[PDB]
Ligand binder design. Structure first.
Ligand SMILES: *[C@@H]1O[C@H](CO)[C@@H](O[C@@H]2O[C@H](CO)[C@@H](O[C@@H]3O[C@H](CO)[C@@H](O)[C@H](O)[C@@H]3O)[C@H](O)[C@H]2NC(C)=O)[C@H](O)[C@H]1NC(C)=O
Ligand SMILES: *[C@@H]1O[C@H](CO)[C@@H](O)[C@H](O)[C@H]1NC(C)=O
Ligand SMILES: *[C@@H]1O[C@H](CO)[C@@H](O)[C@H](O)[C@H]1NC(C)=O
Ligand SMILES: *[C@@H]1O[C@H](CO)[C@@H](O)[C@H](O)[C@H]1NC(C)=O
Lengths: 321, 164, 164, 321, 164, 321
């Protein structure tokens, strides 16, 4: 003889917050905040990141002797440096626009190393055999793999002129360096000329370098310095090196197609074969939700970072069993 | 409750009704049981489903690398870059927090509303043929079988039959 | 509807009423026609007008040139500048979308509320002198002329007049 | 007899979205999003933009030969470049701090060009007649209108010293250039001095330039390069040029008062005499609404740009006829 | 009002009642006076206190130096920095303005809601033992002293003691 | 007998705005906007700001004769400049990376000035007594307190070499300068050598400076210029100065531990012993509220800056007496 109007109730322990009241228990709810990561560094947009092992980007590019790459990968969606990348330029000095170069190499779809100026046939009038104890491999004095140290031949250093035309149909990254001896005695000892200079030029690039001679504290045993320079050579464009001394010549260069809007992640998390649309230094996360508290610095299509520990949205109704 | 039904004059919920959010409990000679109103429940679900989808899917996401590197002579723009990241952090955190707080309140009020609407949808059909006790229960002044109960649930109930 | 009037127990709207949002339909000895309650309609207009103006006028901007130019060695601050513009885009788009979604819901409830408020102000005046059909109509148990109809619409209706 | 309570309905097909329900048909609505522009480039703050025609800001300033039919006003609220502005520095080289100069010239309230170092009386011992095929106009070799190419007169390039004191009561923009020959033979062919230099100084500016001589790829037929430098001279301040060669001397300069907070627009849209508070490259827009989908890049007091195709605000109630 | 009690059928407030937001005015043989309902008043206070605390405390701030210095060859990033600062100004101003407007509206409706809930909480227990005058007043069909009055306020009032 | 249901009312004149209705009078309200400041410059994180008095950061660091030194606090949470700090470098020239240096000195712990190269025992073969009318003290020609002007002794300026090893266990800030004569004759008059250089180097720093000689306008009576250079020397590192002339030698230096995330405020407001978590150029404010209209540029944990003249939140209900 009775009909009643009522609402659902259940065993749900879920609680949400409202503007009026804290910790209201509801029958059903959904979570708008991503609180979890997989603790791994994964492939972004189907492509694995660049792993440099014992070296950083500087050491890898310049070909530091401790950097073991049979081949640099053909492509990467971003670059991973670890706490174990300790080896940059082994010959003390400044890497110019280093941060910029890193940013622009963050993602590439085509990467190949090639011999731009072959060691054997390029420099007949100069001695190419210079090495140093600062750069050592297997207990013996060595040098960068991708650069060549040009010194005077038989007490003479004739003006050198060398050009490369880019037929690769893509951007060629050309690296070189300039050596700065500590004393004027050493300047004449190596390159023979005190008035020496280095000139590098292309359609979009022109610059000149002169040896700065000064006494300096020994870094890695050397009072000398070596500065490192780079330029991205356009397809079809030519680059020309002229020097009366002090030039550390390009040996190997890189041909590439730059991507865009990528970056570098510093994490010791292990790199695996998984996939993600959002990568954080702590690990990859699922991007389906609007918010995440894992980390403010991310690479990918990612939820907006918030410090919220809890965002939980009531779907059901107040639970009253 | 804002509409005064849930935790209102209706004091509690029914664990015995698992098939819907809102419903009826019938009691008569033939037996007793629970039945959920599928229209008010489905309408509520569709509504809440649209709310949840709106909050999530209105977020536009472009591939972005947030991180930036600066050398020791670049400190100013490094802190500028930090002010940007922190600024977006302050904004998104604050808005998200309140958005959940405010819409949780509205969601609970929405259910409270639906329970009341159903109650007064039933009251209007029964009119004086039943007595209003409270706690969402109506006592019939006549005998109502399982066919008659369904008449109430379907909203098809016939007033000019049961009068006495 | 949240308050259960529009698309509620009152099932539809009147195309025949052109002078206001809410109103009455009278039928009596003299004839039938539509009349809008101007107090409830004008109050609603004033409210919504203040709402629309609030959303529009609270927006104030300072003269700004968004565009910025960078060379090929400036890439980092170019991407920083891009993150700022994209960040403001993500924030403003998301908020605007929801602001409309949420306030459209509130606006319809405001109308829904006003209709129910109008209904039960009339119920309160007529009491048992009329029959409550449902559908938002009251059938008089006595004679009501255009003078009598207007008393209900004006809120001046006299209960201790009709014993009949 | 019957009285009924009801609400308005009509033939309105307008639809809005709500949080609970999509595509609800309502009786009345207003649009919060500006979806339309006038397809014109209009005046900002009552002033028309600078139109450079066939030239960009670099070409205009330096006086590129193709820029000499331009009619520039005393002031502009912003600068318009088109897809048709192809004429920059016609002589290959670097424009130093070019993006900055563009930014700083975006709006000026008093603009006059004047002769800083008159061609006739300034350089009696040097040849001012130098031209190049790279700067050709109408198939004939020419040079910049606002600069002068100084070469040796009859076998020698005597050290020149020229100063300008700023009496204009406002900032004077001084542009000049430095020419770098590909070979030392050409260096002596033009300036006769191998040791030549250019020195420029003022209260706020000091610099020295030496010719960088080296082989470079040909740009517009030239292996030579010409670099361009500028400074904003304060009222009362003096600027002094000293050179033994390789100087591209100032002929005309600009006196001006910089505005602030403006920018450059790249648009092929026609410039007209209309007015607006918000300018986009697509056209001017009405600033009364809070949001616009017209363009992400704007100049003015503008509605916030959103990705929304539709923002429509319910005013009336549900339409149910 | 959204719920139609405050500035509704109940036309005004009582200056004579200082002990709460909502309350009762009792009049009987023994005397007359004002009394505040402690359940509804305390809940409203707790709610509004939680709202204000939410708006204030959900804002989290990090130590920040907003100012930055740039030289005359840095013009671009100076204006970039200004765009950031102006952008946060446009966002925070607009959101704060609307947040207050909207929640003030909700707060007043919350009060409007509580008054009606209290009203129909009393009506529900009294039923036909009292007459509905209007303006929120009930005329007893029986005799009610101060002991009976407290029963109404306590929600413990007994209908089947008073047919009298 | 009668019982009635009703609500509170009072004499409250407080008013709020709602989305539907403006200026609704309510019984109670709270203020979300801080409209007032105390007109004082207070201590941040329990520490007072650095006050430079009549001088700016440049003058203080270099030891301009008009400034107050050695009264510098051990630490400060930020820096205050006034409209009255007009005394910078009194010897005309460029301060390199001046803005950067200012930022990094904005907040420091453990700050001491010390004599890195004592005037008496450091330079036996060179003349240290050089002064200038440009840097005046008490109406007499003087020089920077923290720098020393080295000139030739008895027609000779021998190559000098001076090094400092940092044992202080914290960062040492080393400032120095290079003097550029207006004429080559003056160069030979003071420094005796036409070919001259200044070379400064450390582990992380390398650079060379040469005397660029040119005619320039007189600033403070001088056609000469003095450029100022600096570096932050890491603990344990050595810095080495070598010069054949033109060096303005370091006399006093600063040892410090840099803080972070602070800034510089320009205000004429008086500094007092009060405490605040938020400082504005107008004065300190309460950081308890979410919003403030005092000023967009602040230092601290601060309310968000808004244009709002009024933000007032309804607590009570509509007042109807
Ligand atoms: C690649 O990285 C490794 C380590 O990250 C470098 O190996 C050696 O690193 C140690 C530092 O732990 C250097 O220590 C030096 O040892 C010598 C005695 O052998 C001592 O005289 C120095 O004062 C200092 O303590 C060591 O120099 C360094 N190895 C070499 C050959 O210098 C390694 O050098 C990195 N590879 C390259 C090419 O730089
Ligand atoms: C991503 O995949 C699905 C979809 O959201 C979900 O089950 C999973 O938990 C998500 N990942 C994480 C880490 O939550
Ligand atoms: C700056 O110092 C010089 C002398 O060192 C003095 O003549 C000048 O008046 C000072 N600046 C001001 C604004 O007084
Ligand atoms: C901020 O001012 C003082 C801080 O001394 C504090 O007591 C007060 O409560 C704050 N203002 C508001 C409106 O809370």
């Amino acid at each position: 003889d009775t009909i009643c109007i009522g609402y659902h109730a259940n065993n749900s322990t879920d609680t949400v917050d409202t503007v009026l009241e804290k910790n209201v228990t509801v029958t059903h709810s959904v979570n708008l905040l991503e609180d979890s990561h997989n603790g791994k560094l994964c492939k972004l947009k189907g492509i694995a990141p660049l792993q440099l092992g014992k070296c950083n980007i500087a050491g890898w590019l310049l070909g530091n002797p401790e950097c073991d790459l049979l081949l640099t990968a053909s492509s990467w969606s971003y670059i991973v440096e670890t706490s174990n990348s300790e080896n940059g330029t082994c010959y003390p000095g400044d890497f110019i626009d280093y941060e910029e170069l890193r940013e622009q190499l963050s993602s590439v779809s085509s990467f190949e190393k090639f011999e731009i100026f072959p060691k054997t046939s390029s420099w007949p009038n100069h001695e190419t055999t210079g090495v140093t104890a600062a750069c050592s491999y297997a207990g013996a004095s060595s040098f960068y793999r991708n650069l060549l140290w040009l010194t005077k031949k038989g007490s003479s250093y004739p003006k050198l002129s060398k050009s490369y035309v880019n037929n690769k149909g893509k951007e060629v990254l050309v690296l070189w360096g300039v050596h700065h001896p500590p004393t004027g005695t050493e300047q004449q000892s190596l390159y023979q000329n005190a008035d020496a200079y280095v000139s590098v030029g292309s359609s979009k690039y022109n610059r000149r370098f002169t040896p700065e001679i000064a006494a300096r504290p020994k870094v890695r045993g050397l009072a000398s310095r070596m500065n490192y320079y780079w330029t991205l050579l356009e397809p079809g464009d030519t680059i020309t090196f002229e020097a009366t001394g002090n030039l550390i010549a390009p040996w190997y260069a890189f041909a590439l197609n730059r991507g865009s809007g990528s970056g570098i992640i510093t994490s010791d998390a292990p790199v695996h074969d998984c996939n993600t649309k959002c990568q954080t230094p702590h690990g990859a996360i699922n991007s389906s939700l609007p918010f995440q508290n894992i980390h403010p610095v991310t690479i990918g299509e990612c939820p907006k970072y918030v410090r919220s520990t809890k965002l939980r949205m009531a779907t059901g109704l107040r639970n009253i069993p | 409750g804002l509409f005064g039904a849930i935790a209102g004059f209706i004091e509690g919920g029914w664990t015995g009704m698992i098939d819907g959010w809102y419903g009826y409990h019938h009691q008569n000679e033939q037996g007793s049981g629970y039945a959920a109103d599928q229209k008010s429940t489905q309408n509520a679900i569709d509504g809440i489903t649209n709310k949840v989808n709106s909050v999530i899917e209105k977020m536009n996401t472009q591939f972005t690398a947030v991180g930036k590197e600066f050398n020791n002579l670049e400190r100013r723009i490094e802190n500028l870059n930090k002010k940007v990241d922190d600024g977006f952090l302050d904004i998104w955190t604050y808005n998200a927090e309140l958005l959940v707080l405010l819409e949780n309140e509205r969601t609970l009020d929405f259910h409270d509303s639906n329970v009341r609407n159903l109650y007064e949808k039933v009251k209007s059909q029964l009119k004086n043929n039943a007595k209003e006790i409270g706690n969402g229960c109506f006592e019939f002044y006549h005998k109502c079988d399982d066919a008659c109960m369904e008449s109430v649930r379907n909203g098809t109930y016939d007033y000019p039959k049961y009068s006495e």
